[PDB]
Structure 1
């Protein structure tokens, strides 16, 4: 009777160039498609039929 989705990713691109130096970074330079879902389905249909008498012939 309880759900919880903590989505806490951390990214950290640090560059620290000292005397006369350099250097670059390419942090996840791509793609992605993030879904964070908490779904709940509940199917309780009532498909019923009270005929009473059935006389099929189909010559």
Structure 2
């Protein structure tokens, strides 16, 4: 009996922003005027001009291998 399995396989995730070219990106002028506002609960606010954003909660990788020889 000769048990010689070969795993030579590849398991790859490429997730998010990759290999992109951004040549001279111009964000515009941004003006925010706020007067006499009331907030009675949680506020989360973002003000910008140019943003690049990547989260990637994903791209997770999972390999399970089992080898049994019974005689």
Structure number, greater radius of gyration: 1
Q: SS at the partner of 2:7?
A: coil
Q: By percentage of residues, which structure has more strand? A: 2
Stretches of structure 1 lacking an aligned partner (at least 5 in a row):
none
In structure 2, runs of 5+ residues without a counterpart are 54-69
| In structure 1, C-alpha distance between the alignment counterparts of 2:16 and 2:10, rounded to whole Å | 17
| Alpha carbons of structure 1 residues 56 and 29: separation in structure 2 relative to 1, 3 Å | closer
Given the superposition, is the C-alpha separation of residues 34 and 43 from structure 1 closer, same or farther in structure 2, using an over 3 Å criterion? Answer: closer
- Quote the residue 2:32 is aligned against: 36
For residues 55 and 22 of structure 1, the distance between their equivalents in structure 2, rounded to whole angstroms, comes to 16
TM-score by length of 1: 0.20
**Residues 12 and 23 (structure 1), Cα distance of their counterparts in 2 relative to 1, 3 Å cut:** farther
> What value does the CA root-mean-square deviation take over the aligned residues?
33.1
With the length of structure 2 as denominator, give the TM-score of the two structures.
0.18
Distance 1:24 1:56 in 2: 11
